[PDB]
């Protein structure tokens, strides 16, 4: 389960993680 706000999204055939609360993005999955 990702923490609140976090969505796994598409980078072309890759993924990244976006947080809808803070608009932060990061490449690695949140811990
Ligand atoms: Cl959590």
Q: Report the separation in Å between the CA atom of 20 and the middle of ligand 1, taken as the mean of its atom positions.
A: 14
Is residue 1 within 8 Å of 25, Cβ to Cβ?
A: no
Sign of the dihedral defined by the CA atoms of residues 24, 12, 3, 6, in that order: positive
Looking at the structure of the chain, the number of domains it has is 1
C-alpha 1 to ligand 1 mean position (Å)? 7
- For ligand 1, the distance from its centroid to the CA atom of residue 25, given in whole angstroms, is 16
Residue 22 CA, ligand 1 centroid: distance in Å: 15
- Residue 15 and residue 19: Cα distance in Å, rounded? 13
17, 1 in Cβ contact below 8 A?
no
d(Cα 27, Cα 16) in Å, to the nearest integer? 5
DSSP state at residue 27: S
* 26: exposed, middle or buried (Cβ count in 10 Å: 0-12, 13-18, 19+): exposed
CATH number for the domain spanning 21: value is: 2.20.70.10
Range of the domain at 18: 1-31
User: Which residues pair with residue 7 across a beta bridge?
Assistant: 18
How far is residue 31's CA from residue 13's CA, in Å, rounded to a whole number? 22
Q: How was this structure determined?
A: X-ray
Partnered with residue 9 across adjacent β-strands are 16
Q: Which residues contact 8 (CB under 8 A, 6 or more apart)?
A: 2, 15, 16, 17, 29
Q: Could you tell me the distance, in angstroms and rounded to a whole number, from the CA of residue 2 to the centre of ligand 1?
A: 6
């Amino acid at each position: 389960k990702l923490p609140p706000g976090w969505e796994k999204r598409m980078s072309x055939g890759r993924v990244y993680y976006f947080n809808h609360i803070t608009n932060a993005s990061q490449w690695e999955r949140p811990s």
